Design an enzyme around this catalytic site. Structure first.
Site: not given
Ligand SMILES: [Zn+2]
Length: 850
Positions: A130, A271-273, A303-304, A307
């Site tokens: 990202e 980071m939501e990979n 949070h992640e 996503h």
């Molecule tokens: Zn986020």
């Protein structure tokens, strides 16, 4: 790197539709030293063109493109440049492109990051893609609306573990390597593709089947950190989220498995990979920390996870919806925390930490609408976005909001969607008109003040009640529609605490709204017009309710209304409506059962204590500040000493003392705790508490550079190096400040976090006089810093060294004189923001001595 514009992305998206990537990475050389610069990347891309014979391009940032072959024709890549990518002339209806390239590792957590570990020599990799850095690892149409499936195969040093979006199979090659063949993923955007590779320590668990299939779980961290990782607690909270979101969203977890990896030198936080979430290593705790840090880590974990649905299953068409992606995940993480975890008071945290960041940012001269236009990739707040999204949930209705969400997820699954697509699903579900709503809430700046106007009879019942709304400021002064709740609080007959005796929910519109529902209702002792913290606003109280808050805030039973009262008092102080010395008195209390000493929520204690220190250093009249700090440091020593041994409250009180202006009695007590001569019983004086107390002694002249050197030898770690750098900056001599200034402003060889740590010790509330000469040196040397360094490295120097310490009109005059010049815009913005803080402190100081 390319600056893909929205129009370019739209043109490419109109033309192309991508089916699959097959990526082959040769990382066999990846375990060598610093000189290793590149890895082998082969990409096979199958995609369709809607216009046969057309031209288009595909992105790649590599050192050397060895081979490019489109539909069997060899493309000329002699003139290839990173900024141009690979041209694809004469496209067919269905195409296959094969590229062999040499991509390079990074030291910036852009693309595929490479890091080497001292303790054991281990080499650890991870991807960060990202916004558009997937192109640094494989050849791709690197934009979020060209989803595809990916099949990733990696040859790696035989001792490396390898983790990707999907599950995989490992084969020994007999050449000192292993080959990792990952399943074809479900369709996803390029920025969500993940690779994590190194000698990571591994833990495994499983979330059982619930219409949701079993989910295999993993957690990964550097071998050197594994002793500190509390995997059992992370898996409990992970499982709690997977039991929650499927039911809330009506859609089972969309991917196959879920790995969470803690990675070194992570700039992005988490980071939501898809299926492989990456986390900053500060979430692995080496020292004792209070429950608030565990809560905040749980929030980021959820949070992640959120996503996975909102962001990964359904993804934005373009980056102008980045705000909504993050805003939704923030709301959904707190929803899950309250609904599914031990952090049931998490809306209190949101009201006190997220909302207060939102207000401060919204009132800056830099303020802008939540939903900004994003014309390019470098054009790429969230606190306000999260806050406004919570109000959108209230306005639509939670039940309708979730019903709309299932519709949205079902309708756009494995595809892309915009803000308008969400608003349409929520209109269909609720019957509301959300076109009007976005124009008032997402395309505007500033806050409304909400306050009651009331009248009562002889018996204390309301004869009339309205909610008064002020114009949105700073901004266009509009009045918004708010769905809010009004809460009435009064004494509990069994306990004497303040408890809720009435709530009414209603639409508030315009300058004034009458509440007929409240006519005849006893007014109690405390009226909150933003009860349950549903809307984004500046809440204010009627006279009697404000008096009750001042008198008995600690008596409010539920943490959320109590936190909303702490927030009101603070935002009144920031706005020059409550005297800084009156905020301090409210916080410090007079007894074990009043003020912040009686506050059970540890996150509230820490935040309010931080704001009190801001009020003393910045908002209290300079004549009173020495007495204010005498009161603060004495109250904190008494609270730390009375606190339950080994408790979070005890630790928070000691940590607040470590940041304070201290007199001799506090310094002697602190020295005793650090060196053991007179310890506080239960206090764990572990490595990071030692640094905190040492830094406080250094800042007051009670410890020299010898002791800093001694503590660094007992803590020779990268973290220890940073805390030792802060301590050296804190040394209260002109000589130490001059050295720290020179190193922070002019030494570019130093690593980034070491420059950060130098700056973090430059300021201290007891050292104002030492720093006076650096008001002028700041503005004289800022343009040079901005010209010399990149914007990513210059920004923390500009922000961290701004003389927010010097609250004086002379500082405003120097800032004003600098603003008269020609300087880079982004730099003028940061000087403007710093200037605004000083203006606001001057207004507060004026109010305090009144
Ligand atoms: Zn986020």
């Amino acid at each position: 790197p390319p600056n893909l514009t929205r129009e370019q992305a739209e043109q490419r998206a109109a033309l192309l539709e991508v089916q699959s990537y097959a990526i082959e990475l040769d990382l066999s050389a990846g375990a060598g030293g610093p000189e290793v610069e590149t890895f082998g990347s082969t990409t096979t891309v199958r995609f369709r063109s809607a216009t046969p014979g057309a031209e288009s391009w595909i992105d790649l940032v590599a050192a050397r493109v060895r081979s490019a072959v489109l539909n069997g024709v060899e493309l000329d890549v002699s003139d290839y440049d990173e900024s141009t990518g690979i041209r694809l002339p004469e496209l067919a209806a269905d195409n296959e492109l094969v590229v062999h390239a040499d991509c390079q590792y990074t030291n910036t957590g852009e693309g595929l990051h490479r890091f080497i570990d001292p303790v054991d020599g281990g080499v650890y990799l991870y991807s960060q893609f990202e916004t558009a850095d997937a192109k640094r690892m494989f050849t791709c149409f690197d934009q979020p609306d060209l989803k595809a499936t990916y099949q990733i195969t990696v040859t790696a040093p035989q001792d490396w573990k390898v983790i990707s979006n999907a599950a995989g199979e490992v084969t020994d090659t007999g050449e000192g390597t292993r080959r990792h063949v990952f399943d074809t993923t479900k369709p996803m955007s390029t920025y969500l593709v993940a690779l994590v590779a190194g000698p990571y320590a591994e833990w495994r668990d499983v979330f059982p089947g619930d219409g949701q299939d079993e989910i295999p779980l993993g957690i990964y961290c550097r071998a050197s950190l594994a002793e500190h990782l509390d995997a059992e607690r992370l898996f409990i909270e992970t499982k709690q989220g997977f039991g929650f979101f499927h039911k809330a969203f009506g859609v089972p977890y969309p991917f196959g498995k879920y790995d969470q990896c803690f990675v070194p030198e992570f700039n992005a936080g988490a980071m939501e990979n898809a299926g492989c979430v990456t986390f900053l290593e500060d979430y692995v705790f080496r020292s004792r920390v209070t429950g608030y840090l565990y809560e905040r880590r749980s929030e980021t974990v959820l949070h992640e996870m959120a996503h996975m649905w909102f962001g990964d299953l359904v993804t934005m068409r373009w980056w102008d919806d980045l705000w909504l992606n993050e805003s939704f995940a923030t709301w959904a993480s707190v929803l899950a925390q309250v609904g599914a975890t031990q952090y049931t008071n998490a809306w209190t945290t949101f009201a006190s930490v997220e909302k207060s960041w939102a207000y401060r940012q919204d009132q800056l001269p830099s303020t802008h609408p939540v939903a900004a236009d994003i014309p390019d990739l470098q054009a790429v707040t969230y606190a306000k976005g999260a806050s406004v999204l919570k109000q959108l949930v209230a306005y639509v209705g939670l039940e309708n909001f979730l019903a709309g969400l299932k519709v949205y997820f079902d309708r756009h699954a494995w595809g892309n969607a915009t803000l308008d697509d969400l608003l349409v699903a929520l209109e269909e579900a609720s019957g509301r008109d959300l076109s009007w709503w976005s124009a008032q809430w997402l395309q505007t700046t500033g806050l409304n003040m909400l306050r009651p106007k009331l009248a009562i009879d002889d018996e204390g019942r309301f004869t009339s009640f309205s909610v008064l709304q002020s114009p949105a400021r700073p901004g266009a002064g509009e009045h918004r529609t708010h769905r809010l709740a009004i809460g009435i609080y009064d004494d509990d007959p069994a306990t004497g605490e303040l408890v809720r005796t009435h709530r009414v929910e209603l639409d508030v519109t315009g300058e004034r709204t009458e509440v007929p529902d409240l006519v005849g209702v006893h007014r109690g002792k405390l009226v909150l017009v933003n009860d349950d913290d549903l809307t984004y606003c500046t809440m204010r109280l009627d006279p009697q309710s404000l008096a009750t808050l001042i008198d008995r805030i600690a008596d409010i039973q539920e943490s959320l209304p109590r936190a909303l009262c702490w927030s009101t008092a603070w935002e009144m102080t920031r706005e020059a409506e409550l005297k800084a010395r009156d905020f301090v008195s409210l916080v410090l209390g007079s007894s074990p059962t009043t003020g912040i000493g009686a506050e059970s929520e540890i996150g509230v204690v820490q935040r309010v204590l931080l704001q009190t220190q801001t009020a003393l250093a910045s908002y209290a009249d300079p004549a009173w500040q020495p007495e204010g700090w005498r009161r603060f440091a004495g109250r904190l020593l008494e609270l730390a000493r009375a606190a339950e041994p080994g408790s979070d409250h005890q630790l928070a009180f000691v940590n607040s003392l470590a940041g304070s202006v201290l007199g001799e009695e506090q310094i002697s007590a602190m020295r005793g705790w650090l060196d053991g001569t007179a310890p506080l019983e239960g206090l764990t004086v572990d490595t990071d508490l030692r640094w905190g107390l040492l830094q406080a002694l250094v800042a007051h002249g009670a410890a020299g550079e010898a002791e800093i050197d001694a503590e660094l030898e007992r803590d020779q770690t990268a973290t220890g190096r940073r805390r030792a750098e802060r301590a050296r900056s804190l040394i209260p001599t002109p000589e130490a400040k001059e050295k720290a200034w020179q190193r922070a402003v002019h030494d570019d060889q130093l690593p980034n976090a070491i420059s950060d740590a130098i700056i973090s010790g430059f300021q201290h509330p007891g050292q104002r006089e030492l720093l006076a000469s650096y008001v002028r040196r700041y503005f004289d040397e800022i343009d040079e810093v901005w010209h010399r360094r990149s914007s990513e490295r210059a920004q923390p120097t500009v922000i961290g060294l701004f003389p927010s310490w010097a609250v004086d009109e002379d500082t405003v005059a120097v800032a004003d004189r600098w603003l008269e010049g020609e300087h880079a815009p982004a730099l003028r913005r940061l000087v403007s923001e710093g200037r605004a803080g000083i203006v606001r402190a001057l207004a507060a100081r004026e109010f305090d001595r009144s």
